[PDB]
Amino acid sequence: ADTIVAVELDTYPNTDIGDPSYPHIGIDIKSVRSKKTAKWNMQNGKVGTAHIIYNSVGKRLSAVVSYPNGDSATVSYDVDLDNVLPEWVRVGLSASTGLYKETNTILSWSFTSKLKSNETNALHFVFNQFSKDQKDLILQGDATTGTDGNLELTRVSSNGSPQGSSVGRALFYAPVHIWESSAVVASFDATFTFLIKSSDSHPADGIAFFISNIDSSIPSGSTGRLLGLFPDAN
Amino acid sequence: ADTIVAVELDTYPNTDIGDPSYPHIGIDIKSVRSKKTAKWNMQNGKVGTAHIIYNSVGKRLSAVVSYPNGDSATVSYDVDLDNVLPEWVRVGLSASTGLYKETNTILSWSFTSKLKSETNALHFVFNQFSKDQKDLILQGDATTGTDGNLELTRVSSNGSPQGSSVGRALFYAPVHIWESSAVVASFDATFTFLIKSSDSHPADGIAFFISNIDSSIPSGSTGRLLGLFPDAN
Amino acid sequence: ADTIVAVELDTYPNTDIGDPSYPHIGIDIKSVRSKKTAKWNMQNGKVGTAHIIYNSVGKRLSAVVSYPNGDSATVSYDVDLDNVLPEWVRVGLSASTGLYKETNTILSWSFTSKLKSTNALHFVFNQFSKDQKDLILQGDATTGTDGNLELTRVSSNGSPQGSSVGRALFYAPVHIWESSAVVASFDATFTFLIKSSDSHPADGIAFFISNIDSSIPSGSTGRLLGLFPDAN
Amino acid sequence: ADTIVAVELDTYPNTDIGDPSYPHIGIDIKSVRSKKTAKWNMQNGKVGTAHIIYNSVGKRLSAVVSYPNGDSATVSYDVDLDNVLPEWVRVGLSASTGLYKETNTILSWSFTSKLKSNSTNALHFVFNQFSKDQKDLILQGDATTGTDGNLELTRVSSNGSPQGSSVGRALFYAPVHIWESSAVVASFDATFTFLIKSSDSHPADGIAFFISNIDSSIPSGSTGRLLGLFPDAN
Ligand SMILES: CO[C@@H]1O[C@H](CO)[C@@H](O)[C@@H](O[C@H]2O[C@H](CO)[C@@H](O)[C@H](O)[C@@H]2O)[C@@H]1O
Ligand SMILES: CO[C@@H]1O[C@H](CO)[C@@H](O)[C@H](O[C@H]2O[C@H](CO)[C@@H](O)[C@H](O)[C@@H]2O)[C@@H]1O
Ligand SMILES: CO[C@@H]1O[C@H](CO)[C@@H](O)[C@H](O[C@H]2O[C@H](CO)[C@@H](O)[C@H](O)[C@@H]2O)[C@@H]1O
Ligand SMILES: CO[C@@H]1O[C@H](CO)[C@@H](O)[C@H](O[C@H]2O[C@H](CO)[C@@H](O)[C@H](O)[C@@H]2O)[C@@H]1O
Ligand SMILES: [Ca+2]
Ligand SMILES: [Ca+2]
Ligand SMILES: [Ca+2]
Ligand SMILES: [Ca+2]
Ligand SMILES: [Mn+2]
Ligand SMILES: [Mn+2]
Ligand SMILES: [Mn+2]
Ligand SMILES: [Mn+2]
């Protein structure tokens, strides 16, 4: 089974598996049941921004999700990722839909990891436009790149209609060296902008930024509440 | 007085004003009496590296100080800097000596400030300090070099530190460190330093700090006050 | 005199002083009389992007100005800035109007310089505050409250004013070359909105590099772009 | 054959294939015969720095090689890489030895690529320390990394002596999007530091930073003067 650190933007409360009874941002460490959540007012059809911060000094995994009117939700969990994550990982964006559905449109994704000193090893990438054949992204499941310049993690119909029982992920092509014992500071940040839209009063299931073993793949059956991330809801 | 946030590398235990009883790093929030400290083994005449990190999301200001052998000290403090600093600030390095002394040499210094939101950002790096470093406001006893170095406190051309000394270097531009509509207002800073002393103890330390724009060395803030504070409250 | 290096987006053909007979971009080296120009189709009331890059190794100062439709103008000039600029400088944006006028609105501005053997400076403005403390505003510039930098004088339904000159300089001096720098490079990017209902628009926006103490020269409204004392 | 844009630090003059009669930095466009060279004083056993810059506005491919004493050699060639390179590439470092040899030690490598339009897609990586199992590098031929934190492009013997007839390359794992038609600026730069040490009547053959097709492979027989870059000396 893969190892997952994720920040989930969970649009659909699955109260039978420990979701609060509201849409929430969450920090997930090796379980879909978030270690920490914050109530999130998903603004339907608006462009949201998620920013994810971690460094190995503070060891605080933090995420904010904001929309341009100003509504933000933030969540943090102190967690020592040296003890969770393989040294070398892939980083990715994941989304899913189940009985209910939403567009899980990515409009930009940036990522920076650094290992300083003690000098710096670093990876940074930015995608503000996704390309039809995006050679530095590993697309899994239903994830597709436009154009439009967007990354549709899950299936959207010809007529605009998001489809249920969809899951897809984008992972950056290069392995990322997330920690290294000799490093004084290991830090990462990620930001992505997304367009979650539902004509259903029931958007589902959400979007995650995730960190994974290098060979990570969509667990069989991880549509819906499992967010393309987990094989079960344990 | 000034509003001060700082990460002190405090080489001299002033246990009478709250220092722990060893060299230490500490996070100073409007007071020289740190909100959190960690024991710090300062390695005499070694080049050390201090990394300071804040994000507005985590609301946690963290510092690590390390030397090449791997030995490191870390302090974090939970704090919302929106509640502490003014929107606009200067960032700087400060050092002092007192009745005891040490070199407070800065070999490099970087800083990055970002405000989203879109994004405003400032980043500078000094790996070399010119004799005329026009983008630094030197205050008190700093000195720009050669040795290519920034000397926060008085040394002799021949390496020897001086007592009762206080010096700061502030970056020339004001920095917009937070802003009420910023969803992320983060910064980090790193400096490398060489603290050397033949004294009976080393004193007093170097701090990275953030102050109001018009911040000057407060009267009599040599020694334990680290060029930062008007008194020890 | 000030020493000036600039990339002008010159919206008004001053052919008496060597402008080409069309709006143009140019590379200004110690003179308003461009060392190199390219024809520029300014798109009125559109947002444009200027990208300036100087390659210390390549010894080449290059600019593109584009608009969202893909229309671009490009100019490069081969020049060793070690022999032109003083070592310490301020960088900034300058615009002017004269007898004809345009909005000279800056919506964003970024800048990066690096001196390697590495010192660096980078700043990005995507929004300008009404009190933007890290900008030295000169003349009729003017930031906020709409998040924009208004280099010359607009009233207030956005209607441009004539005889206006305004530049904005980053508050910190920049160490733009050094004798012992193996690489002394910079780029700048600014996005702009030039709008006019005049007969022509005038006069243009420049990115400039100048001495630290550089001020708007007396009578540098108009074709002088707030940059130069005369048109030699 | 692969398509190759390289900046070569060529230590050994192969005057029978158009090299000048001195060591040199060269710009190579689809030939080992540099389009532009500059005389280079290789400082044997010193750490050199090479910086390579290009953007699609000036279209000038520039390279400098310097040593701490301040000896530098600069080379530039105007060339439109849109017309040379495939849209998507891998970037790498390559070295070779033939009859004569040298260590071709890489101590750091940074690379940044950006595609800007009207305000970006970007890749940036820095290696200041190469690790024993550096998962984001594709190592080809004799190239090895770490524990000493270096990349040895070509064979160095147990006793420190560089071996002849060696070729190795390191390519960054992810494909790079080097040009894109809708971009108003495409730029890249690369920096690497290196330590070429040789013992006799002797240094060969050089180090190149190169840009190639994604599936670029060491051409058979590309030891020696071909720098691990070219199938032949044409
Ligand atoms: C020698 O120990 C000293 O005690 C003195 C009085 O008992 C007093 O002056 C102390 O302070 C001076 O020196 C230290 C270390 O340099 C500074 O921290 C002080 O601010 C002061 O300058 C010292 O504990
Ligand atoms: C009406 O809500 C649902 O009750 C269903 C009956 O058991 C159940 O299938 C459904 O879950 C499905 O859809 C969810 C929202 O998309 C998703 O989280 C689940 O994994 C599943 O697909 C929900 O409980
Ligand atoms: C009518 O056009 C003008 O011709 C005038 C007579 O020569 C002249 O004064 C005027 O120049 C002014 O306006 C220009 C465009 O705004 C400006 O470039 C000049 O410096 C001057 O202010 C323009 O040529
Ligand atoms: C001593 O000069 C050599 O003459 C040899 C016989 O023709 C020849 O093989 C040799 O070239 C070899 O060594 C070079 C330096 O390493 C290398 O560039 C060649 O590719 C080849 O391996 C050189 O010309
Ligand atoms: Ca859920
Ligand atoms: Ca103390
Ligand atoms: Ca003109
Ligand atoms: Ca050769
Ligand atoms: Mn959840
Ligand atoms: Mn203390
Ligand atoms: Mn002109
Ligand atoms: Mn050659």
mmCIF file with all atom_site columns, C-alpha atoms in Angstrom, chain A residues 152-231:
data_model
loop_
_atom_site.group_PDB
_atom_site.id
_atom_site.type_symbol
_atom_site.label_atom_id
_atom_site.label_alt_id
_atom_site.label_comp_id
_atom_site.label_asym_id
_atom_site.label_entity_id
_atom_site.label_seq_id
_atom_site.pdbx_PDB_ins_code
_atom_site.Cartn_x
_atom_site.Cartn_y
_atom_site.Cartn_z
_atom_site.occupancy
_atom_site.B_iso_or_equiv
_atom_site.pdbx_formal_charge
_atom_site.auth_seq_id
_atom_site.auth_comp_id
_atom_site.auth_asym_id
_atom_site.auth_atom_id
_atom_site.pdbx_PDB_model_num
ATOM 1  C CA . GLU A 1 152 ? -9.247  18.156 -15.239 1.00 0.00 ? 152 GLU A CA 1
ATOM 2  C CA . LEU A 1 153 ? -8.454  15.633 -12.534 1.00 0.00 ? 153 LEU A CA 1
ATOM 3  C CA . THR A 1 154 ? -11.776 13.852 -12.961 1.00 0.00 ? 154 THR A CA 1
ATOM 4  C CA . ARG A 1 155 ? -14.172 13.385 -15.878 1.00 0.00 ? 155 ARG A CA 1
ATOM 5  C CA . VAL A 1 156 ? -16.184 16.200 -17.223 1.00 0.00 ? 156 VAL A CA 1
ATOM 6  C CA . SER A 1 157 ? -18.732 15.451 -19.968 1.00 0.00 ? 157 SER A CA 1
ATOM 7  C CA . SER A 1 158 ? -18.875 17.154 -23.342 1.00 0.00 ? 158 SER A CA 1
ATOM 8  C CA . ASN A 1 159 ? -21.844 19.194 -22.078 1.00 0.00 ? 159 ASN A CA 1
ATOM 9  C CA . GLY A 1 160 ? -19.801 20.478 -19.117 1.00 0.00 ? 160 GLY A CA 1
ATOM 10 C CA . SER A 1 161 ? -21.347 17.968 -16.741 1.00 0.00 ? 161 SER A CA 1
ATOM 11 C CA . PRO A 1 162 ? -18.942 16.463 -14.189 1.00 0.00 ? 162 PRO A CA 1
ATOM 12 C CA . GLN A 1 163 ? -19.181 12.718 -13.966 1.00 0.00 ? 163 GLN A CA 1
ATOM 13 C CA . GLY A 1 164 ? -19.618 10.518 -10.888 1.00 0.00 ? 164 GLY A CA 1
ATOM 14 C CA . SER A 1 165 ? -17.322 7.559  -10.094 1.00 0.00 ? 165 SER A CA 1
ATOM 15 C CA . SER A 1 166 ? -14.291 9.388  -11.446 1.00 0.00 ? 166 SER A CA 1
ATOM 16 C CA . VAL A 1 167 ? -10.800 9.606  -10.048 1.00 0.00 ? 167 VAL A CA 1
ATOM 17 C CA . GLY A 1 168 ? -7.638  11.055 -11.536 1.00 0.00 ? 168 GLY A CA 1
ATOM 18 C CA . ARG A 1 169 ? -4.315  12.335 -10.390 1.00 0.00 ? 169 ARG A CA 1
ATOM 19 C CA . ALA A 1 170 ? -1.406  14.404 -11.749 1.00 0.00 ? 170 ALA A CA 1
ATOM 20 C CA . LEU A 1 171 ? 2.027   13.701 -10.358 1.00 0.00 ? 171 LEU A CA 1
ATOM 21 C CA . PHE A 1 172 ? 5.140   15.579 -11.176 1.00 0.00 ? 172 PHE A CA 1
ATOM 22 C CA . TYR A 1 173 ? 7.407   13.499 -13.373 1.00 0.00 ? 173 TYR A CA 1
ATOM 23 C CA . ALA A 1 174 ? 10.562  13.788 -11.265 1.00 0.00 ? 174 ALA A CA 1
ATOM 24 C CA . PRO A 1 175 ? 10.973  12.113 -7.921  1.00 0.00 ? 175 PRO A CA 1
ATOM 25 C CA . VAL A 1 176 ? 11.297  14.704 -5.176  1.00 0.00 ? 176 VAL A CA 1
ATOM 26 C CA . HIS A 1 177 ? 13.879  14.388 -2.451  1.00 0.00 ? 177 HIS A CA 1
ATOM 27 C CA . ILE A 1 178 ? 11.589  15.322 0.440   1.00 0.00 ? 178 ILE A CA 1
ATOM 28 C CA . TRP A 1 179 ? 13.947  14.783 3.347   1.00 0.00 ? 179 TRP A CA 1
ATOM 29 C CA . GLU A 1 180 ? 17.611  13.904 3.712   1.00 0.00 ? 180 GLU A CA 1
ATOM 30 C CA . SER A 1 181 ? 19.166  13.200 7.139   1.00 0.00 ? 181 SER A CA 1
ATOM 31 C CA . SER A 1 182 ? 22.097  15.598 6.718   1.00 0.00 ? 182 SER A CA 1
ATOM 32 C CA . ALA A 1 183 ? 19.800  18.518 5.752   1.00 0.00 ? 183 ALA A CA 1
ATOM 33 C CA . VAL A 1 184 ? 19.351  21.277 8.320   1.00 0.00 ? 184 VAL A CA 1
ATOM 34 C CA . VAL A 1 185 ? 15.992  22.371 6.847   1.00 0.00 ? 185 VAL A CA 1
ATOM 35 C CA . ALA A 1 186 ? 13.726  20.373 4.533   1.00 0.00 ? 186 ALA A CA 1
ATOM 36 C CA . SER A 1 187 ? 10.854  22.518 3.401   1.00 0.00 ? 187 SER A CA 1
ATOM 37 C CA . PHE A 1 188 ? 8.122   22.217 0.884   1.00 0.00 ? 188 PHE A CA 1
ATOM 38 C CA . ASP A 1 189 ? 5.317   24.290 -0.355  1.00 0.00 ? 189 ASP A CA 1
ATOM 39 C CA . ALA A 1 190 ? 2.641   23.764 -2.862  1.00 0.00 ? 190 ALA A CA 1
ATOM 40 C CA . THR A 1 191 ? -0.048  25.918 -4.224  1.00 0.00 ? 191 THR A CA 1
ATOM 41 C CA . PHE A 1 192 ? -2.747  25.202 -6.655  1.00 0.00 ? 192 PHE A CA 1
ATOM 42 C CA . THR A 1 193 ? -5.831  26.965 -7.936  1.00 0.00 ? 193 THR A CA 1
ATOM 43 C CA . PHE A 1 194 ? -8.925  24.989 -8.678  1.00 0.00 ? 194 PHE A CA 1
ATOM 44 C CA . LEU A 1 195 ? -12.408 25.387 -9.952  1.00 0.00 ? 195 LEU A CA 1
ATOM 45 C CA . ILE A 1 196 ? -14.880 23.139 -8.150  1.00 0.00 ? 196 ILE A CA 1
ATOM 46 C CA . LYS A 1 197 ? -18.278 23.308 -9.709  1.00 0.00 ? 197 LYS A CA 1
ATOM 47 C CA . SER A 1 198 ? -21.412 21.320 -9.007  1.00 0.00 ? 198 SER A CA 1
ATOM 48 C CA . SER A 1 199 ? -24.988 21.757 -10.356 1.00 0.00 ? 199 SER A CA 1
ATOM 49 C CA . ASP A 1 200 ? -25.884 19.231 -7.711  1.00 0.00 ? 200 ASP A CA 1
ATOM 50 C CA . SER A 1 201 ? -26.500 20.679 -4.169  1.00 0.00 ? 201 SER A CA 1
ATOM 51 C CA . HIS A 1 202 ? -24.019 17.875 -3.616  1.00 0.00 ? 202 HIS A CA 1
ATOM 52 C CA . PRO A 1 203 ? -20.494 18.582 -4.743  1.00 0.00 ? 203 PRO A CA 1
ATOM 53 C CA . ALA A 1 204 ? -18.264 15.520 -4.247  1.00 0.00 ? 204 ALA A CA 1
ATOM 54 C CA . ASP A 1 205 ? -15.711 14.411 -3.512  1.00 0.00 ? 205 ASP A CA 1
ATOM 55 C CA . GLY A 1 206 ? -12.837 16.866 -3.433  1.00 0.00 ? 206 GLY A CA 1
ATOM 56 C CA . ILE A 1 207 ? -9.269  17.615 -4.402  1.00 0.00 ? 207 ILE A CA 1
ATOM 57 C CA . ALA A 1 208 ? -6.051  16.689 -2.651  1.00 0.00 ? 208 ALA A CA 1
ATOM 58 C CA . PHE A 1 209 ? -2.436  17.735 -2.844  1.00 0.00 ? 209 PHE A CA 1
ATOM 59 C CA . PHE A 1 210 ? -0.561  14.588 -1.916  1.00 0.00 ? 210 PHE A CA 1
ATOM 60 C CA . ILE A 1 211 ? 2.868   13.240 -1.310  1.00 0.00 ? 211 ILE A CA 1
ATOM 61 C CA . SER A 1 212 ? 3.489   9.638  -2.113  1.00 0.00 ? 212 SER A CA 1
ATOM 62 C CA . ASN A 1 213 ? 5.996   6.892  -2.688  1.00 0.00 ? 213 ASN A CA 1
ATOM 63 C CA . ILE A 1 214 ? 7.528   7.354  -6.071  1.00 0.00 ? 214 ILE A CA 1
ATOM 64 C CA . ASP A 1 215 ? 5.589   4.476  -7.678  1.00 0.00 ? 215 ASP A CA 1
ATOM 65 C CA . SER A 1 216 ? 2.360   5.597  -6.101  1.00 0.00 ? 216 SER A CA 1
ATOM 66 C CA . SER A 1 217 ? -0.763  4.766  -8.167  1.00 0.00 ? 217 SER A CA 1
ATOM 67 C CA . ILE A 1 218 ? -4.498  5.244  -7.793  1.00 0.00 ? 218 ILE A CA 1
ATOM 68 C CA . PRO A 1 219 ? -5.606  2.549  -5.325  1.00 0.00 ? 219 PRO A CA 1
ATOM 69 C CA . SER A 1 220 ? -8.272  0.285  -6.905  1.00 0.00 ? 220 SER A CA 1
ATOM 70 C CA . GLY A 1 221 ? -11.681 1.634  -5.855  1.00 0.00 ? 221 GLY A CA 1
ATOM 71 C CA . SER A 1 222 ? -10.430 4.976  -4.546  1.00 0.00 ? 222 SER A CA 1
ATOM 72 C CA . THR A 1 223 ? -13.135 6.907  -6.356  1.00 0.00 ? 223 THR A CA 1
ATOM 73 C CA . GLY A 1 224 ? -15.494 8.855  -4.087  1.00 0.00 ? 224 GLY A CA 1
ATOM 74 C CA . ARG A 1 225 ? -14.620 9.403  -0.441  1.00 0.00 ? 225 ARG A CA 1
ATOM 75 C CA . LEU A 1 226 ? -11.132 7.894  -0.797  1.00 0.00 ? 226 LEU A CA 1
ATOM 76 C CA . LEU A 1 227 ? -10.100 10.765 -3.101  1.00 0.00 ? 227 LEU A CA 1
ATOM 77 C CA . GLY A 1 228 ? -7.845  8.638  -5.371  1.00 0.00 ? 228 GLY A CA 1
ATOM 78 C CA . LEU A 1 229 ? -5.537  8.423  -2.356  1.00 0.00 ? 229 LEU A CA 1
ATOM 79 C CA . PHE A 1 230 ? -6.359  5.494  -0.054  1.00 0.00 ? 230 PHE A CA 1
ATOM 80 C CA . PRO A 1 231 ? -7.364  1.852  -0.642  1.00 0.00 ? 231 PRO A CA 1
#
